[PDB]
Amino acid sequence: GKIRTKTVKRASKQIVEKYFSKLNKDFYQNKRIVMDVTIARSKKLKNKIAGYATHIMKRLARGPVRGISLKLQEEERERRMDYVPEVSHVDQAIQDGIRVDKQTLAMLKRMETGVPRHVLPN
Amino acid sequence: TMMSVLANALRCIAGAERRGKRQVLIRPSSKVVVKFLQVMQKHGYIGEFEIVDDHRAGKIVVNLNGRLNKCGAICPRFDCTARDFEKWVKNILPSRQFGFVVLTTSLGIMDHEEARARNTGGKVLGFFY
Amino acid sequence: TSVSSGAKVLRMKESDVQKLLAMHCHLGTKNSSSAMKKYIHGRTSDGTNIIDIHMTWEKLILAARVIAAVENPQDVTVCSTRLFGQRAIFKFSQLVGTSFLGGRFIPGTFTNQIQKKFMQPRVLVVTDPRTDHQALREASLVNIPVIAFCDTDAPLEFVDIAIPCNNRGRHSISMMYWLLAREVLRLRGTIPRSVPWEVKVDLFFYRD
Amino acid sequence: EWVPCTKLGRLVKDQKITSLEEIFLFSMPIKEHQIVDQLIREGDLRDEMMLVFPVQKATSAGQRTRFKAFNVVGDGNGHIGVGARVGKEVSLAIRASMIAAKLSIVPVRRGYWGNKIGEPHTIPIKVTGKCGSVAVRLIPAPRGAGIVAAPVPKKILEFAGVEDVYTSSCGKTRTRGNFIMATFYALRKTYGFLTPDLWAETEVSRDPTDEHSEFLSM
Amino acid sequence: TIGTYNEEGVNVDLYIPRKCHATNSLITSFDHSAVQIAIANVDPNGVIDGTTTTLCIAGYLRCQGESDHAINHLAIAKGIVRIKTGKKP
Amino acid sequence: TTKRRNHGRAKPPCSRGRVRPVHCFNCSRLVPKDKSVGRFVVRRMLDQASARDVAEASLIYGSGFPMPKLYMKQRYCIACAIHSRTVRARPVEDRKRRYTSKV
Amino acid sequence: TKTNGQHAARKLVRLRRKNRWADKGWKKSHTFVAQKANPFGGSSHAKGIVLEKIGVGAKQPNSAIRKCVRV
Amino acid sequence: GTISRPGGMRPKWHKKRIKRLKRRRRRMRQRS
RNA sequence: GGACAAGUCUGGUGCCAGCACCCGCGGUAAUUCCAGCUCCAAAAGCGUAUAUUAAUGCUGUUGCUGUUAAAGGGUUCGUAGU
RNA sequence: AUUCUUCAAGGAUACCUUCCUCAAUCAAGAACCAAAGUGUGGGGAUCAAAGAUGAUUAGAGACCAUUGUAGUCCACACUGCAAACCAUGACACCCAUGAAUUGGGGAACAUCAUUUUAUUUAUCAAUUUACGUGCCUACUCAGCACGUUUCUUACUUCUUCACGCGAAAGCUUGGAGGUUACAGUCUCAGGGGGGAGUACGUUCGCAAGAGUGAAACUUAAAGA
Ligand SMILES: [K+]
Ligand SMILES: [K+]
Ligand SMILES: [K+]
Ligand SMILES: [K+]
Ligand SMILES: [K+]
Ligand SMILES: [K+]
Ligand SMILES: [K+]
Ligand SMILES: [K+]
Ligand SMILES: [Mg+2]
Ligand SMILES: [Mg+2]
Ligand SMILES: [Mg+2]
Ligand SMILES: [Mg+2]
Ligand SMILES: [Mg+2]
Ligand SMILES: [Mg+2]
Ligand SMILES: [Mg+2]
Ligand SMILES: [Mg+2]
Ligand SMILES: [Mg+2]
Ligand SMILES: [Mg+2]
Ligand SMILES: [Mg+2]
Ligand SMILES: [Mg+2]
Ligand SMILES: [Mg+2]
Ligand SMILES: [Mg+2]
Ligand SMILES: [Mg+2]
Ligand SMILES: [Mg+2]
Ligand SMILES: [Mg+2]
Ligand SMILES: [Mg+2]
Ligand SMILES: [Mg+2]
Ligand SMILES: [Mg+2]
Ligand SMILES: [Mg+2]
Ligand SMILES: [Mg+2]
Ligand SMILES: [Mg+2]
Ligand SMILES: [Mg+2]
Ligand SMILES: [Mg+2]
Ligand SMILES: [Mg+2]
Ligand SMILES: [Mg+2]
Ligand SMILES: [Mg+2]
Ligand code: NA
Ligand code: NA
Ligand code: NA
Ligand code: NA
């Protein structure tokens, strides 16, 4: 079998997090970078770490990966999410008119507020 | 069949207080039941209760304030001489500092502390604390 | 709710009723439990349960008055394992100043004292008693009261203050948290009651 | 070398919460045995080991032997604690039992038999504790009649501070582990019984964790 | 004045436990499900003033699922929750 | 030690006195009807290969007319239902699944 | 579960009389049968004449000769 | 097996063995 | 040795002789036998046997147990009794 | 446990009918009681104790195969021995939750017929009572089912059932709960394991058997 152990997988995630820029989808250039920024002794381990890092870069180019959490990608994601529409969704729904049921109408008619405006049965 | 109205009523009250209820319904009622409840109420263990009339043996609704730990009847109604109060207190009461044993005497139904003051014996009915 | 002098403030207005109806916050499920049966006001022909709007508002204000009495807002934590509520609790904690826990609840967060993520809240708010069952069970070991948003089929063990509402639906959850945040700020001096709040409810919506 | 990890520990480490009664009032759990060490004066804790026996688990090629130890702790009057732990060595099990005993510490109520002259000397009411098949019953006794109990419960009652009691037992009391726990449960129950002297309402108070909210949030 | 007293006016109890506001039962020191809830008072304007109302719940009520019903009863009795909706003007 | 609350059959107390026995489909052992393991089996008369070859020769089933089937209600004794792997022993806290219907 | 009757003294007395024969300790002291089978006539000691010296082997886990006598 | 240790032969067959013993005693006493 | 207060002492014997109310000890290093020296209990007293009371909520009125440990009659009717 | 025709019963439900403690449980006593078994007449297809033959096996008086008598079935008399079990005595009270089900009734469908108040309120509400479908004379019918909401009786389930209890397995409106905080009423059994449900005596039975029921001795455990 060719399963990568947890020592290899943990190191590869750390390298991609710290040196995402200057890494690409080529094993041979990624290997030179890995040897530069890794202190470990085994040459076999460093080859496996470069291999799994190249695998992650290929995955990242098509979609997010659950364990990476890049800073720049996260910041742009937050900015996109915090979008404020011109008109609130609740305001647009009220202006369109609200339809209720007979049971809901009966409950509203017995309250101190009464049936509010923009409320029609059907 | 039901053989003791007093025992049935005291079991309903003790069961309800164990479950932490606020009110309990008792059926059927009787003169002895009402007198027993009046002794408990005078010492502050139950509170207000009401009797409903139905042209038969009535019904009682009792309000509970959460101060009653246990009540129960004693069957059969053993005779108690005026010098035997300490024996019953030692046997069926948590301590000598609180709790009452209810007796029926020729002067009426009363707790054991009042009976000692009037120097009368009788027959043991029950207890509460 | 009521106050010491019957000032008739804090009562729900026409606009608040409109927001609840527009977001379908009054629509329950078809099932029903014994504990939740007192909050149900009628049932539609389809089988849906209608929640009593008056009871929903009274419980919501009671929850707000409990939260507003905590000196340190970090002593209140909001939890949610449902996907639709993770965004809402994030915005809620940002506005009010509380802590939050989204996703899977790690067991032992409130009981294992030697871990690095040990937490000791004073008040707990959860989105769903059924899915947030682990948080409620832990709160019953370390003396923590619980506020919960409940649907018509929810179990009420370890729940202290239940707010009956629609627990499912991205719009319904967001509106309930938006209403609770606005009331807590109003009970403080932060925002006035005479001017509509400028924060849009769409910020609380869950987005992919 | 103690670094508290709970809000209660930080309050006790500073000179706040000067008594165990503050903790007992609000039912807070105790998760650091250094709290009890600080809140009870030196020369009064008075712990002792009650029972240590081996337990075995069958394995392929033999069995594994461990040691379970029981410990009792308690000041002169009103406090008692019992703990039991397992370890690979007798010394390791004994040390772990002392910590467990301190963590589970409860107050004991005391009262009078007939006349309230000097000081509480007996238990106020009849109590019963049950663990396994063992049930232990404690009955108030008059002054002078001392601790009428078997050697195992007698040692626990002395540490709790009780002076006069009658004792009854039922079940298989030769199981010393259940005998020790049943006595502890009976003494725990003394503060859960509502008597007419406690009817007169109560006054609310703030918990330590919010009275000192500003100090903790640091 | 709560507690047991000597022949002279000396209180000889270690401490006085809390009582549940719903069941009038003592709250022990080994009961870790008991809770205390504080509700803030509100000025004529919707702003808290600094005082609170405190409720104590036994703890076995919480385990059995009756704490929500009990708190409802207590809040109505204390004058915090309105029992029913108002009438139309 | 009581293994099952219903004791392996479908006869509650205070419901019946006696249930008539039936013969096991395999060994002819007599077993009460409510205790036996019963299955309703619908079997095709021919497999796919043989059915195709018969249909070419037949003028009736040659154009979209169903071939007949075999219907049987088989009741097993407990020993025969286990040895034939109709049922198997199940873990505790799993013995309580019921499967009221097919599949 | 017993009567508890207040006029059922006869039933309780009869119940205890019948059930007291079920323990060996009470029955042995009240039956006069063990006394007749006892070589001593209910006494603590007796005198006799020695007939033979015998050796009795010990029970299985032990192993010895016990040096008894026939009287 | 559905029963705990009997400590002997099967109780049904032990009962039958005593069953046959009682007949032989009855016949032997009949001869006198 | 334990229950049960008091020796990981020194010789002899070697599943023998013996001890041991019960659990158990004795086949070559016996904490138990036969002895020496020390030590323990209570003491002008102290062992052993048999009977009896308490231990015993193992006869249970106060106060037992009856699904699986011993123990609910195969089912109804029914008199005395309660 | 097929259908039809008959005979006498039984429970539940409905009722502004009648009566007025007439009841609960029970030594003695009575009736009924699976299969096997017994007696006298019928009947005899199937299966099949005993027996026979063939295999298998070291052996095989067994399991497998082919047979085969009594029995298995009916009528009239006996017997009274079951893991006759829910291994759980009868009567009475309280008791949390969600889905179902068997019988009866009410609402609905169908058929006929033609309270004050209340401008200034609220602490335990003065009316949540809502809702449709299919079949149906060119009559066991003003009928039959279904859908929705209540009620009384019965057998149950929770794998999305609460206290409490128990040595535990487990029980839980139907308790094994409401019990050292030990008392609703009556009755039947048990007191370490064996010897033994044996011996002797006596009652019942055609027999087979059934009921009642010891001791001498022997054991440190047996059991859950
Ligand atoms: K089955
Ligand atoms: K087996
Ligand atoms: K030697
Ligand atoms: K017993
Ligand atoms: K015959
Ligand atoms: K055959
Ligand atoms: K029998
Ligand atoms: K029926
Ligand atoms: Mg004892
Ligand atoms: Mg039936
Ligand atoms: Mg049967
Ligand atoms: Mg088995
Ligand atoms: Mg058995
Ligand atoms: Mg010795
Ligand atoms: Mg010693
Ligand atoms: Mg002796
Ligand atoms: Mg030596
Ligand atoms: Mg004696
Ligand atoms: Mg005694
Ligand atoms: Mg048995
Ligand atoms: Mg029976
Ligand atoms: Mg048929
Ligand atoms: Mg027959
Ligand atoms: Mg014939
Ligand atoms: Mg035969
Ligand atoms: Mg054969
Ligand atoms: Mg044949
Ligand atoms: Mg026949
Ligand atoms: Mg039986
Ligand atoms: Mg038991
Ligand atoms: Mg039992
Ligand atoms: Mg009793
Ligand atoms: Mg015996
Ligand atoms: Mg004869
Ligand atoms: Mg014959
Ligand atoms: Mg016989
Ligand atoms: Na005795
Ligand atoms: Na046959
Ligand atoms: Na059975
Ligand atoms: Na149930």
Author numbering:
A (entry chain AL): 2 to 123
B (entry chain AJ): 2 to 130
C (entry chain AC): 35 to 242
D (entry chain AP): 42 to 259
E (entry chain AR): 3 to 91
F (entry chain AV): 2 to 104
G (entry chain AS): 2 to 72
H (entry chain Bz): 2 to 33
Quote the original article.
Accordingly, 80S ribosomes were purified from PS and TB11Cs6H1 sKO cells, their composition was verified by MS, and the purified ribosomes were subjected to cryo-EM data collection. The initial cryoEM dataset included 459985 and 552813 particles for the PS and sKO ribosomes, respectively, yielding a 2.93 and 2.95 Å reconstruction of their entire 80S structure, respectively. The resulting EM map allowed us to clearly visualize the entire H69 in both maps. These high-resolution EM maps allowed us to build, refine and model all 9 rRNA fragments (SSU, the two large subunit (LSU) fragments, 5.8S, srRNA 1, 2, 4, 6, 5S), E-site tRNA, and 42 and 34 ribosomal proteins in the LSU and SSU, respectively. Using these maps, we could visualize and model 82 Nm, 6 base modifications including m1acp3Ψ, m62A, m5C, m7G, and 43 Ψ residues. The modeled Ψ positions are in concurrence with Ψ-seq and HydraPsiSeq detection. Interestingly, four conserved modifications (Ψ942, Ψ996, Ψ1747 and Am254) were localized to trypanosomatid-specific expansion segments. The location of eS12 is at the head of the small subunit at the ribosome surface facing the solvent. Closer inspection of both PS and sKO models suggested that ribosomes lacking Ψ530 (sKO) have poor and hardly any EM density in the position of eS12, unlike PS ribosomes wherein the entire protein could be modeled. To visualize the structural differences between PS and ribosomes lacking Ψ530 (sKO), we superimposed the two structures and observed very similar global architecture.
